[PDB]
Amino acid sequence: MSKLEKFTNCYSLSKTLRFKAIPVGKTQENIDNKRLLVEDEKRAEDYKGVKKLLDRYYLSFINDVLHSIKLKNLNNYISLFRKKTRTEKENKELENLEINLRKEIAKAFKGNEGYKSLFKKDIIETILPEFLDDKDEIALVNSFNGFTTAFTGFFDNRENMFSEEAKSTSIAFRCINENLTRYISNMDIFEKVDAIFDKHEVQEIKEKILNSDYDVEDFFEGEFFNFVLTQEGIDVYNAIIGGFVTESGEKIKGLNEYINLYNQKTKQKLPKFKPLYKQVLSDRESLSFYGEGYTSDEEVLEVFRNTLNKNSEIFSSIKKLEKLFKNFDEYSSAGIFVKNGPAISTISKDIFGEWNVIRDKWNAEYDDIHLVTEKYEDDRRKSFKKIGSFSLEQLQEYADADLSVVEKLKEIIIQKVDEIYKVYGSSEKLFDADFVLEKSLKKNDAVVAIMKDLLDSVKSFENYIKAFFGEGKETNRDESFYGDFVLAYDILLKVDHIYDAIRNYVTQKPYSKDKFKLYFQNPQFMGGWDKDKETDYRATILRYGSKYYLAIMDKKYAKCLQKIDKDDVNGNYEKINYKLLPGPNKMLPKVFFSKKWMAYYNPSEDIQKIYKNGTFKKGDMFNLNDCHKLIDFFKDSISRYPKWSNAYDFNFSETEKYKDIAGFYREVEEQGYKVSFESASKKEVDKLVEEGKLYMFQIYNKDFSDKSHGTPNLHTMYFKLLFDENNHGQIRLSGGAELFMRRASLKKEELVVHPANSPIANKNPDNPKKTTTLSYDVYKDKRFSEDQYELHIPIAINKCPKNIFKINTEVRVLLKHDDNPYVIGIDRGERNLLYIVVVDGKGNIVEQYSLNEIINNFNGIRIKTDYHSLLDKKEKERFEARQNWTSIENIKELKAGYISQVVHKICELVEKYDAVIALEDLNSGFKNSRVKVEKQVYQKFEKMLIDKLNYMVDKKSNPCATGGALKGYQITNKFESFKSMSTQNGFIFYIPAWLTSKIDPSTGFVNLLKTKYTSIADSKKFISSFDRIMYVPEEDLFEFALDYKNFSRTDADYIKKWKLYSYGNRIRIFRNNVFDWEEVCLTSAYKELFNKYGINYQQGDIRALLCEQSDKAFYSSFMALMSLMLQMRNSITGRTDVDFLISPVKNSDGIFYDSRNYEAQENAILPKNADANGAYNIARKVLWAIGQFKKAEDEKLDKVKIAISNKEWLEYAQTSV
RNA sequence: AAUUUCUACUAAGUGUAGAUGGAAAUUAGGUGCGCUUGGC
DNA sequence: GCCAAGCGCACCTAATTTCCTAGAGGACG
DNA sequence: CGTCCTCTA
Ligand SMILES: [Mg+2]
Ligand code: NA
C-alpha cells in the first residue's frame, strides 16, 4: 500500500455545482406570459432596499448599546497586555481577560429584551415600520410581509455581528482583538514620541479636531478607549493621527505627519501611529472636505468646453502668462524669485538638466569660504535650509557663459505652450457644438485621450509656472510682475478641481446588471428536496435517459405532480424521491417531545425528567444508563413514526453499546438519507408544461450535448454520481439550491464571428494542423449574447466520516516507517513563478523544472503555454490602463487558470511518488510586500493547492477506486483559514527558508562574511583575518584561505575552513540612479585594482602588503570585489538567459560548482540554476524533519520540531557530500 | 474561437484538456493619479 | 528624478464568517 | 380545518 491510501473519508465538506437551465417546451412562453422574471428582478432591487433599511435600524441598535458601555475588565487587561515579562500563566490570564471583554460586549447586545425579535419576522412586520418615518420606505418594507423567510440568511449575517467569539465578522472581535490592540500599541508609541510635539501643534489639533473638549494625550490613556467604540469616536481618533482637509483645501496635520517631519529633519526614524479600523456596519462620512464631482457624460462635456475652449477663462491666462514670460526683461531679475524647495529642484532640472545642480553649485560657493567632514555637510545643509528663496538674478550667477537662465526659461515656456497648441489641434472636433458622442465616456477611449492629453499639458504648464511664485514674503519682490502673475495663476489653479473630477468620473467602471434570483412567487422556493416538502418548495428533479430536468410547479398547482401515475405502456420520466433526516441530535427531541407527538406517546417522567435535566449529554452531569433508555425511547418512537420508519430501513446497533448519545445520533444521521426514482407518464407531465401548471428546465452543461465525446468535467461526474447506486452516502445532494436569471450582456450581431467554410488559423505553434475549417459559424463569447438561467446545486462530501484521526499525526507516523519517502520541493518566486524539484528519501534529485511554462500533450499534439509571459503582459496592460484612464482588466482569472495547471501537475507528482510537499515558511507579511508585483501567485497558489488536497480526485480513476470521485484523498486539513494554520498542513510542510538558495549544493558553502565597507581599520582587520591571500600562477586565480572562526558571527558554519577563489564572472547590481548591471571578471578585476595602487600581487602572501595601503578607495573597492566573489547567485533583471549559481569554493575533486554546467544537461544530478537549488534545499529541509520523526517514539511524533535551525542546516548540507 | 464558470485551445467538427464552493454579509489590502507639507 | 507622512478619487483583489433543513407551529380564510 | 409562511434546534 501507499501513504495516500490511508486518507479517505476523514472529514466532511460542502461544494456547489453549477449548471445552465434550458427551458423546455412552452416553459419559456408561459414564464413570459405570467411576467415572472420582471417580478423577480424588481424583487431583488426592493430586497436590497429593505436590507439597507434594516441596517439603519441595526446600526441605531448597535450605537445605543456601544455609546453606553463601560468596559469593566478593561484596566486589568491593558495593564497585563503591556507587561514585558509574562509567565505562561500570565499569558493565559490575558486570554481570559480578552475573552471576558468580548463577553461584555456580546451580552450588552444579547441581554436586550428585543434581541431575539431582531432576527424574526417581527423586525420587518412591526419594528422597522415603527422606527421609520417615510411613507415610501415603510411601504417598501410592508411589501415583504408574507416573504420574511427570504431574509433568513441575511438574519444570520447580522446575527454574526453579535457573537462573543474571536471571529472576523464580530463587533466584539473588531473592538477587542483589533482596535483595542492598536489603541494599546499607540499608547506606547505616544509615550515614546510624546515630546516631539510643541504647544502650538497640540493646540491646533485640540481646536480643529477635538472641538476644544479634550487634550490630545487623553486619547492615549486606557480609560478613554470607550470613546473609540463607535465610528464617531474612531473618526476623531484617526483624525488626531492623520489630520483632515478643510473646506478651503488646507491639510491640517496629524501626529503621524509631525512625526514624519521631525524624522526627515533630524534624519532619525521615530515610529508612527496606527489608525483604528472602522466599526462594523457604520455608514462612514469623512472628516475631510472633498468637492462635488460629476454625474453624467453631458455634464463632463459641458464643463470641459466652458472651462477649456479658446475664449475660456483658464486659457486666457495661459495666453497671459505666455506673453508675460515672453517679456521677462521689463522686470528686475532681483525681485522675481524661486522658493527654496521643490520649486528650486524643478527649475534646476528644467535649466541644468538635473534636480540637484543648483544645490551643488551653491555648495561649491559655500566651500569656497569655509575651507570634520560630517560636521561640515550638516552645517552646510542647515545654512542652505535657512534660505527661503532664490531670485532669478542670483540664479544667473550659476549659469555658464553659453547659458543665460532667462532666455532658457523663455524657450521652456514656449516649449510647453506649443505643446498645448498641438493638443488643441487634435481637439478641434470635440470643442464644436455639433459634435455628440457615438460612445459613452466610460467606454470611449478616443475621446478620453483627447481630453486627458489636453488636461495633462495644462497641468504640465501649471507646475512650471508655480515654481516662479517664490516664498512671496520677500521684500525686493517686483509687484509689477507678481500683480499680473498672481492674477493669471490663481485662475489657472481652477484646473486642479476639474482635472481631479474628470478623472474621478471618466475612470468609472460602466454599470453592468447582475444576475438575479428567481423565487417563482415562493419565499422558500426550492428550499430542499424531501418528498414530504415537494408542495412547500415546488421544485423537483426528473430524469429521462441521460438528461436531467428541474421541474417547478406553479403557485396555484402545488399538487400537480404528485398525483401523476405511471404510463406502463408509453414513456416515463423518472421522478426523484428524496428523503433526509437532518441533524438527528436536534430533530429527534423536537419531533418526539412535541405536542403533536406527546399526545400520541407519552414519555414517562423517567424519560421526561432526563431530557428536562440534561443528563443525556456527556459533560458535568452525565449518566450512561439514562441515555441508554432515552435511545430506546427514541428507537421505540421511530417505529411508531410513519414518515420515517418506512423511508429509511433502519439497522441500529444493540443499545447497550453506545457510550453517549452522539453514538446513536450518528447512526440515525448516516441512515437518514435515501434517494430513489419513481416512474411518471411523460405524456401527462409534458401536458402540464403545455398548460403552464409546470415549468421544466434541462439541467445542462456541454458534457450533456449530443456531440460530447471527451472526458467529462469533474463536476459532471459529481452530479451524476449523486444518483448512482454505487454512491452509498459519500456524496449527498443537499438543499439550498438556487436558480438565477443572467440577462444577455452582448448583442449577438456585435460578436466576433469566424464564418462557416473559411479556414481559421490555429494558434498552437506545435500543432502541425495549421488551419481548421468548419461548416458552421463560431462566435466569440456566444454564451453572454443570450439570456441564461443558471442553477446552483450544493452537495455534501463525506457527510459521515469513518476515518477520524489527527491528519498531521498520521502523516508523521507514516513518514517515520517509510523506508524511502519522496519530497516535492516548491520554490516560489517572480523570476520563476514556481520551481519544482522532486527528491527521493536520500535526497537524490529525481525531477526538476520551472513552471513558468506549462507543457501538456494530448492526441500526440504538444502544447506549451508561457503563463509567466501572459501574466507579465496582463500586469503591464493594467499598469498602462491606470495611467491612461483606459479599461483596467482582470488578472485573477488568468492566475487561477495558470494555478490550476500547476495544482494538477503537483497532484500527479503526489500520486506518482507518494510524496509530501515542502514549502518556505513565508510569513504573512512577506507575502503582502510582494503583492505590488501583480504577477504574484504565492497565496493564490496556496489556497487552490490546499483546496484541492481537501478532496483530491483523479477524475480518470474508477469512481469507487481510492482517489476516484467517491473516495477522494484528504491530505490537507479542512481549510478554515490562513489565520489558523501551523507549519504542517497534512502532506504540506513549511520549513525555514534561510540559505536554501544562496548555498553551494556541492559543498554546503555559504557566505557568512560581512563585507560592506565601513572604514580603513575595519578593512585592515578583515584582510588580516584571512589565513592567506595569494595569487596562484598555475591557475591564474587569487586564493583567499579563511577559517570562519576568525570572523564575526560565523558560528552556524560546520566545516569552518574554506579556500575561496576569484573564479569566473559575476553580475554586479547597482544604480547609476536606477538598477543597472555590469559583468565582472573577478581575477581580471583583482588585477586591475592591485595595479591601480602599485600592488605587487605576485609576492606570495599579500595580506600584510595590502594593509600598507592608506587610500580609503582601495579598501572600499577591495571589499566590493569580495562581496561580488561571495555573491553566488547572479542574474539580470527581467531576463531568462541569466540566473546562474556559481561557487567560489572547490569540491573534493577541485571543481567549482557552476549551475550552467547543469542547465545544459537534460537529466542533471545537481540543481540547474539558483531557483532549482532553492527548491532542492527546501525539500531537503523537510528530509531533515522526516529524519527527526524517525529519531522519535510514535507517541511523541506530534511534538517533534520540524524547523531546522540554521546551525543544523549548514552541518546537514556540509556533511551530505 | 464555442464553456455552469475559468484558463489554454480547435483537439478532427456545434466541440477538446485541465481546474471550478456557491450565496449572502462583513471587512481589509494593492496599484494608479491629484492635492498638502517635507526628505535626498 | 526619486522618496516620506497625510487627505481624496477610481480600479481590482481578497480574508473570514454563516447556511447548504424537515417538520412542528402559527396565522388565517 | 387547509393552506401558506415562520420558526426551531
Ligand atoms: Mg471534456
Ligand atoms: Na492609496
For residue A929, the number of C-alpha atoms closer than 13 Å in the C-beta half-sphere is 6
Non-local (6+) Cβ contacts of A85 within 8 A are none
Same domain, A942 and A847: yes
Helix axes A479-492, A313-325, angle to 10 degrees: 150
Under DSSP, the state recorded for A713 is: P
Nearest residue, CA→C1' of B40: A356
Task: Give the three-state DSSP class for A1073.
Answer: coil
Q: State how far the alpha carbon of A935 is from the alpha carbons of A833, A870, A878, A931, A1133, in Å.
A: 8, 9, 11, 8, 15
Q: Is A40 a catalytic residue?
A: no
Q: Is residue A316 part of a domain?
A: yes
Q: What is the CA(A543)–ligand 2 centre distance, in A?
A: 54
Reported residue count of chain A is 1217
Residue A1202: its H or E element: none
* Residue A1149 to residue A1147: CA distance in whole angstroms: 6
DSSP code string of A385-444: HT--EEEHHHHHTTS-TT--HHHHHHHHHHHHHHHHHHHHHTSHHHHSTT---SS-GGG-
Nearest residue, CA→C1' of B11: A859
Query: Could you tell me if A106 and A177 are in contact, meaning their C-beta atoms sit under 8 angstroms apart?
Result: no
Question: Which of A220, A243, A266 corresponds to the end of one domain?
Answer: A266
* Residue A1085 to residue A919: CA distance in whole angstroms: 39
Under DSSP, the state recorded for A22 is: E
Beta strand pairing call for A988-991 and A916-920: parallel
Q: What is the CA(A242)–ligand 2 centre distance, in A?
A: 14
Same domain, A1067 and A1108: yes
Beta strand pairing call for A694-700 and A547-553: antiparallel
* Residue A1018 to residue A456: CA distance in whole angstroms: 53
Same domain, A366 and A258: no
Burial of A785 (0-12, 13-18, 19+ CB in 10 A): middle
CB atoms within 10 A of CB A680: 20
Burial of A73 (0-12, 13-18, 19+ CB in 10 A): middle
Burial of A131 (0-12, 13-18, 19+ CB in 10 A): middle
| Ligand showing the shortest atom-to-Cα distance for residue A858 | 1
Beta strands in A12-59 (DSSP E): 13-23
Q: How far is CA A1110 from the centre of its chain?
A: 54
Same domain, A254 and A316: no
The domain total for chain A is 5
Q: Which residues of A515-551 are buried (b: 16+ CB within 10 A; e: fewer)?
A: ebbbbbbbeebbbbbbbebbeebbbbbbbeeeebbbb
Query: CA of A929 vs C1' of B30, distance in Å?
Result: 9
Q: Torsions phi, psi of A458, nearest 5?
A: -65, -40
Nearest residue, CA→C1' of B31: A932
Pick from A38, A22, A32, A25: nearest CA to A691: A25
Handedness of CA A247, A250, A251, A254 (dihedral sign): negative
DSSP code string of A1124-1146: HHH--EEE-TT-SS-EEEEEEEE
Pick from A252, A278, A640, A324: nearest CA to A482: A324
DSSP code string of A241-295: HH-EE-TT--EE--HHHHHHHHHHHHT-----PPPPPPPTT-----SS-------
Query: Could you tell me if A517 and A791 are in contact, meaning their C-beta atoms sit under 8 angstroms apart?
Result: no
> Which 922-951 positions of A have CB less than 7 A from strand B?
928, 931-932, 934, 944, 947-948
* Residue A1109 to residue A1089: CA distance in whole angstroms: 12
* Residue A262 to residue A810: CA distance in whole angstroms: 57
Q: Is A780 a catalytic residue?
A: yes
Query: Could you tell me if A1140 and A1155 are in contact, meaning their C-beta atoms sit under 8 angstroms apart?
Result: yes
Q: Is residue A814 part of a domain?
A: no
Which nucleotide is closest to the Cα of A558 by its C1'?
D3
Q: Is residue A111 part of a domain?
A: no
Query: Could you tell me if A312 and A306 are in contact, meaning their C-beta atoms sit under 8 angstroms apart?
Result: yes
Beta strand pairing call for A13-23 and A788-797: antiparallel
DSSP code string of A992-1029: --TTSSSS-TTT--------S---HHHHHHHHHTSSEE
Same domain, A1084 and A1119: yes
Question: Which of A476, A506, A536 corresponds to the end of one domain?
Answer: A506
Residue A60: CB less than 7 A from any atom in strand C: no
Q: By residue range, what is the domain housing residue A361?
A: 297-506
Same domain, A1079 and A1128: yes
Residue A775: CB less than 7 A from any atom in strand B: yes
Same domain, A1024 and A1128: yes
Residue A884: CB less than 7 A from any atom in strand C: no
Q: Is residue A1000 part of a domain?
A: no
Q: Is residue A238 part of a domain?
A: yes
Pick from A910, A932, A836: nearest CA to A1173: A836
Same domain, A307 and A448: yes
Q: Please, what's the largest Cα pairwise distance for chain A?
A: 116
Beta strand pairing call for A251-252 and A834-839: unpaired
Same domain, A314 and A261: no
Of A478, A920, A942, A1000, the catalytic one is A920
Pick from A536, A515, A964, A948: nearest CA to A740: A515
Query: CA of A857 vs C1' of B18, distance in Å?
Result: 11
Q: Is A763 a catalytic residue?
A: yes
> Which 2-31 positions of A have CB less than 7 A from strand C?
14, 16
Helix H, strand E, coil C: the string for A910-922 is HHHHCCEEEEECC
* Residue A1142 to residue A1007: CA distance in whole angstroms: 12
Task: Give the three-state DSSP class for A667.
Answer: helix
Pick from A537, A550, A555: nearest CA to A576: A550
Pick out residues whose CB falls under 7 Å from strand D: A 116, 120-122, 145-150, 152, 522-524, 535-536, 555-556, 558, 583, 585-586, 589-590
Nearest residue, CA→C1' of B18: A901
Q: Which residue matches cell numbers 595602487?
A: A1093
Cell of residue A178, nine digits = 483589533
Same domain, A343 and A489: yes
Non-local (6+) Cβ contacts of A860 within 8 A are none
Q: Is residue A311 part of a domain?
A: yes
Q: Is residue A698 part of a domain?
A: no
CA end-to-end distance (rounded Å), chain A: 33
Q: What is the CA(A1016)–ligand 2 centre distance, in A?
A: 45
Query: Could you tell me if A827 and A1171 are in contact, meaning their C-beta atoms sit under 8 angstroms apart?
Result: yes
The neighbouring-strand residues paired with A1040 are A1029, A1060
* Residue A665 to residue A668: CA distance in whole angstroms: 5
Nucleotides of C strand lying within 7 Å of any protein CB atom: 1-2, 4-25
Same domain, A212 and A321: no
Pick from A980, A974, A982: nearest CA to A15: A974
* Residue A1176 to residue A1213: CA distance in whole angstroms: 11
Question: Which of A662, A682, A717 corresponds to the end of one domain?
Answer: A662
Q: Is A920 a catalytic residue?
A: yes
Which nucleotide is closest to the Cα of A47 by its C1'?
B24
Pick from A594, A615, A617: nearest CA to A663: A617
Burial of A659 (0-12, 13-18, 19+ CB in 10 A): exposed
Q: Is residue A532 part of a domain?
A: no
Non-local (6+) Cβ contacts of A796 within 8 A are A12, A13, A14, A731, A732, A734
Task: Give the three-state DSSP class for A978.
Answer: coil
Q: What is the CA(A1161)–ligand 1 centre distance, in A?
A: 36
Q: What is the CA(A879)–ligand 2 centre distance, in A?
A: 15
Residue A387: CB less than 7 A from any atom in strand B: no
Query: CA of A553 vs C1' of B15, distance in Å?
Result: 35
* Residue A607 to residue A616: CA distance in whole angstroms: 10
Residue A1212: CB less than 7 A from any atom in strand C: no
Nearest residue, CA→C1' of C3: A264
Residue A1038: its H or E element: strand A1037-1043
Which technique?
Answer: X-ray
* Residue A637 to residue A648: CA distance in whole angstroms: 14
Q: Torsions phi, psi of A848, nearest 5?
A: -155, 135
Nearest residue, CA→C1' of C23: A591
Same domain, A446 and A493: yes
Query: CA of A346 vs C1' of C1, distance in Å?
Result: 10
Task: Give the three-state DSSP class for A506.
Answer: helix
* Residue A641 to residue A1192: CA distance in whole angstroms: 55
DSSP code string of A804-869: -S-HHHHHHHHHHH-SS--EEEEEE-SSSSEEEEEE-TT--EEEEEE-SEEEEEETTEEEEEEHHH
Cell of residue A965, nine digits = 470521485
Q: Is A1051 a catalytic residue?
A: no
Q: Is A200 a catalytic residue?
A: no
Query: Could you tell me if A437 and A444 are in contact, meaning their C-beta atoms sit under 8 angstroms apart?
Result: yes
Query: CA of A72 vs C1' of C16, distance in Å?
Result: 29
Nearest residue, CA→C1' of B12: A772
Q: What is the CA(A927)–ligand 2 centre distance, in A?
A: 18
Pick from A66, A107, A70, A109: nearest CA to A231: A66
Counts for chain A of helices (H) and strands (E), in that order: 45, 34
Task: Give the three-state DSSP class for A1040.
Answer: strand
Residue A1164: its H or E element: none
* Residue A385 to residue A264: CA distance in whole angstroms: 13
Integer Rg of chain A from CA: 38
* Residue A1184 to residue A1163: CA distance in whole angstroms: 25
